[PDB]
Structure formats: structure tokens, C-alpha cells
Enzyme design. Structure first.
Site, mmCIF file in Angstrom:
data_model
loop_
_atom_site.group_PDB
_atom_site.id
_atom_site.type_symbol
_atom_site.label_atom_id
_atom_site.label_comp_id
_atom_site.label_asym_id
_atom_site.label_seq_id
_atom_site.Cartn_x
_atom_site.Cartn_y
_atom_site.Cartn_z
ATOM 1 N N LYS A 155 2.687 -5.768 -20.612
ATOM 2 C CA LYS A 155 3.892 -5.975 -19.817
ATOM 3 C C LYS A 155 3.795 -7.256 -18.994
ATOM 4 O O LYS A 155 4.782 -7.972 -18.821
ATOM 5 C CB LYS A 155 4.167 -4.767 -18.920
ATOM 6 C CG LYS A 155 4.675 -3.550 -19.684
ATOM 7 C CD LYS A 155 4.856 -2.352 -18.772
ATOM 8 C CE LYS A 155 5.718 -1.286 -19.431
ATOM 9 N NZ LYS A 155 5.145 -0.821 -20.721
ATOM 10 N N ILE A 194 16.241 14.528 -1.293
ATOM 11 C CA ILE A 194 16.657 14.450 -2.687
ATOM 12 C C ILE A 194 15.532 13.863 -3.528
ATOM 13 O O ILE A 194 15.218 12.678 -3.423
ATOM 14 C CB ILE A 194 17.927 13.593 -2.876
ATOM 15 C CG1 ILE A 194 19.109 14.215 -2.131
ATOM 16 C CG2 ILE A 194 18.256 13.448 -4.358
ATOM 17 C CD1 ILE A 194 20.429 13.514 -2.386
ATOM 18 N N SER A 221 -0.506 4.016 10.631
ATOM 19 C CA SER A 221 -0.849 2.604 10.764
ATOM 20 C C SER A 221 -0.704 2.109 12.203
ATOM 21 O O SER A 221 -1.317 1.112 12.586
ATOM 22 C CB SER A 221 -0.006 1.746 9.817
ATOM 23 O OG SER A 221 1.373 1.857 10.116
ATOM 24 N N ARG A 233 -3.877 2.032 14.010
ATOM 25 C CA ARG A 233 -4.687 0.917 13.534
ATOM 26 C C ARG A 233 -4.163 -0.416 14.063
ATOM 27 O O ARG A 233 -4.717 -1.473 13.762
ATOM 28 C CB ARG A 233 -4.738 0.896 12.005
ATOM 29 C CG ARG A 233 -5.207 2.199 11.382
ATOM 30 C CD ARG A 233 -5.743 1.986 9.975
ATOM 31 N NE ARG A 233 -4.825 1.216 9.141
ATOM 32 C CZ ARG A 233 -3.840 1.748 8.424
ATOM 33 N NH1 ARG A 233 -3.638 3.058 8.438
ATOM 34 N NH2 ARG A 233 -3.057 0.967 7.691
ATOM 35 N N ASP A 237 7.254 5.521 10.247
ATOM 36 C CA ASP A 237 7.581 6.734 10.985
ATOM 37 C C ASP A 237 6.522 6.999 12.053
ATOM 38 O O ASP A 237 5.612 6.192 12.240
ATOM 39 C CB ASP A 237 7.691 7.937 10.041
ATOM 40 C CG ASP A 237 6.453 8.126 9.173
ATOM 41 O OD1 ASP A 237 5.430 7.450 9.413
ATOM 42 O OD2 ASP A 237 6.500 8.963 8.248
ATOM 43 N N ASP A 243 3.638 9.803 13.295
ATOM 44 C CA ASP A 243 2.851 10.958 12.884
ATOM 45 C C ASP A 243 1.982 11.425 14.048
ATOM 46 O O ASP A 243 1.012 10.762 14.417
ATOM 47 C CB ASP A 243 1.982 10.591 11.677
ATOM 48 C CG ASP A 243 1.441 11.806 10.947
ATOM 49 O OD1 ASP A 243 1.920 12.929 11.208
ATOM 50 O OD2 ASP A 243 0.542 11.635 10.096
HETATM 51 NA NA NA Z 1 14.178 11.410 -1.564
#
Ligand code: NA
Ligand code: NA
EC number: 2.7.7.7
Length: 314
Positions: free
Chosen positions: A64, A98, A172, A175, A182, A184
Site C-alpha cells: 500500500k 454510536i 496525558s 504527564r 478528556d 480521567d
Molecule cells: Na462512537
DNA sequence: CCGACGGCGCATCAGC
DNA sequence: GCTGATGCGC
DNA sequence: GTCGG
């Protein structure tokens, strides 16, 4: 990026289609792994054979790459992009909640766009409706300054509930990243051990001060939801909160701090030293979990110098 | 050749 | 009503 | 898709 960005973009796009359309999760991760190793390759790739030398790049990806290098595109990718069914399925999965299955089912019944979703609310579960509501916001990065402000609120409200709670924002951000996808949050309490409504009370308080705005899922040990800084309007952000036993807390903190490569490296070095490290416990090789009172104890078990989160990039 | 590859919490489906 | 499977996200 | 038993 100018080096092999065309190649890594190609591989990432291939990864998404394998996951979302073909529902081939292992090919998805295979392409992601190849995309990763190439992104770190400090040379402009001249041939598929050259890339083949890298771990994670095999015969098909080499072929590829050869096509992409000689044409500037991939025939299969070009056709896939143009396909209305495949592109719609792939796009719908950008909605949180989804996945490939829901996306395929929606497209099968003519539901292909956010507009189609908006006028078919009855066909969406709670998570998906929230994902749809904050579709734009969820794809935005979170600058570190906001993450700091978000951390200020979390640590403050958590201690307000019970001053014996321990909360650590990982990912992250811990760090020292300049941006986050987001937040956490790892949470523990002296009363919660592996041997013996802690989460609810924290979520309740964060909702009380209007920090948490929506809930995707919530049980006794894991909350997944949405939050928003007060305006002096900030985008809505994804926040997860995990309740972890005290004796498993710092193994969890280490794991969710990352990075993924660092975890893989730390687990490898641990194995050569006679230990196995997961997200929960560290055990001699597996026997019984060893007592862990901090991140440093993990490093000491495997004869490693304590690595600051700042330096856990690799 | 052919099986492993992130493992599990929560929401919701399939089935009894 | 329940148990177990699946989807989903991370 | 790639790796390795
Ligand atoms: Na999704
Ligand atoms: Na290779």
C-alpha cells in the site's frame, strides 16, 4: 509530519474503515500500530520495503505504501471515500455511543446524517442522545489551562464531601500535556479496600455545583459523564471518574497516567525482573498481589528509578 | 498454518 | 422477573 | 494485518 504524514494519514483512515465498516477490530489496531511506528520513524520513507523493516509493518502495508508513493493515493481508499454507505457508517461512529453496529443499522434504514439522527431521537439510547447533543464539543481539545481549572473544581468538591478521599487526575494531563481529549479522575478512600455509596456522593456534589451536567453511565465503581467550567461559554467536556480500592489505587494511577508505550515498556522490563504488572496489581511470576503504597514502590519492585509522569512519554 | 491481539464496567439486548 | 451476551468506550 | 508458536 511532512516526512511520512501522507502515509500515516492513509493508515489511520484505513484503520477507521476496518473498525467502523468492516468491523475488524484487529485490523484496526494493526493499522494503528503501523501508523504509530511510522510516525516515529525519523526518515522520509522511500519505499514499502524500507517500511517493512519496522515492527508492525508487513507485506500488505508495504504494498500500500508503494502504491501511495508512486501515485499519491490509494485506489481502494479513493473508492471507499466515495461510497455513500461506507462514508455514512464511518461518520456516524463519531457520535459517542454510536459504534459500528449502531452506525450500520442506522444507515440501513436511511439514517445517515446528524440531521437524520436529530429527527429520529426515539431510535437513540441515552448515551447516543448525549453524544449527539455535544457532537461538536466532544471533538474539541481541552487546553491545559482549562484542565487545571477543571482539576481545581474536582479536588475542591471531592475534599468537601469527605476530606479522606484521594483524587488524582491522570491521562496525558498528569504527564504535563499542553492539551487533553478528556479528564480521567481516579478516586479512592481508606474505607474502600479489596478486602472490604462512595462514588455516588462525589458525583452528587459535582452535580450540585453544576460542574457535571450529564451522565453517560454510572455504577458503584465507574462514572462516565459530561462536565463544564462556569463562564465568567465553555464547551462541554468528557469526564470519567473511577472508584478504586486503596490497595490497587497506585497501580491504577500508574496505568491511567501512561503513556501506552511507557506501560508496554514498563511491563516488559517487569517481566524480565520476575514480575507481572497490570492496571490493578503487581504480582511475582502469578502469585499474590504485592503491597503498593505509591507509584515508587512499583518501580522499586522492578529495580527501576522512579520516573516522573513528565518523562513517561516512552 | 493458525491463534493472539486491551480487559472490563455499564447499558441494553436476547432469551428463558 | 432473571441470567448471560453483546455493544460500547477507553 | 502482523507477528510468532
Ligand atoms: Na462512537
Ligand atoms: Na515488519
Amino acid at each position: 509530519e511532512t516526512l511520512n504524514g501522507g502515509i500515516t494519514d492513509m493508515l489511520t483512515e484505513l484503520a477507521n474503515f476496518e473498525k467502523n465498516v468492516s468491523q475488524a477490530i484487529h485490523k484496526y489496531n494493526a493499522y494503528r500500530k503501523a501508523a504509530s511506528v511510522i510516525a516515529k520513524y525519523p526518515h522520509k520513507i522511500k519505499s514499502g520495503a524500507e517500511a517493512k523493516k519496522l515492527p508492525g509493518v508487513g507485506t500488505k502495508i508495504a504494498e500500500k505504501i508503494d502504491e501511495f508513493l508512486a501515485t499519491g493515493k490509494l485506489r481502494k481508499l479513493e473508492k471507499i471515500r466515495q461510497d455513500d454507505t461506507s462514508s455514512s457508517i464511518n461518520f456516524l461512529t463519531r457520535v459517542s455511543g454510536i459504534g459500528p453496529s449502531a452506525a450500520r443499522k442506522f444507515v440501513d434504514e436511511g439514517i445517515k446524517t446528524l440531521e437524520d439522527l436529530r429527527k429520529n431521537e426515539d431510535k437513540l439510547n441515552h448515551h447516543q442522545r448525549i453524544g449527539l447533543k455535544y457532537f461538536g464539543d466532544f471533538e474539541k481539545r481541552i487546553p491545559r489551562e482549562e484542565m487545571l481549572q477543571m482539576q481545581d473544581i474536582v479536588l475542591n468538591e471531592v475534599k468537601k464531601v469527605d476530606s479522606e478521599y484521594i483524587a488524582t487526575v491522570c491521562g496525558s494531563f498528569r504527564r504535563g500535556a499542553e492539551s487533553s481529549g478528556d479528564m480521567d479522575v481516579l478516586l479512592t478512600h481508606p474505607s474502600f479496600t479489596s478486602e472490604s455509596k462512595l462514588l455516588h456522593q462525589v458525583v452528587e456534589q459535582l452535580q450540585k455545583v453544576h460542574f457535571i451536567t450529564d451522565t453517560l453511565s454510572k455504577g458503584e465503581t465507574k462514572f462516565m459523564g459530561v462536565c463544564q467550567l462556569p463562564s465568567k461559554e465553555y464547551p462541554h467536556r468528557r469526564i470519567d471518574i473511577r472508584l478504586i480500592p486503596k490497595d490497587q489505587y497506585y497501580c491504577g494511577v500508574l496505568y491511567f497516567t501512561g503513556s501506552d508505550i511507557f506501560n508496554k515498556n514498563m511491563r516488559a522490563h517487569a517481566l524480565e525482573k520476575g514480575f507481572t504488572i497490570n492496571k490493578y496489581t503487581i504480582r511475582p511470576l502469578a502469585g499474590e498481589p504485592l503491597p503498593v503504597d505509591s507509584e515508587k514502590d512499583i518501580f522499586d519492585y522492578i529495580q527501576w528509578k522512579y520516573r516522573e509522569p513528565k518523562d513517561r512519554s516512552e
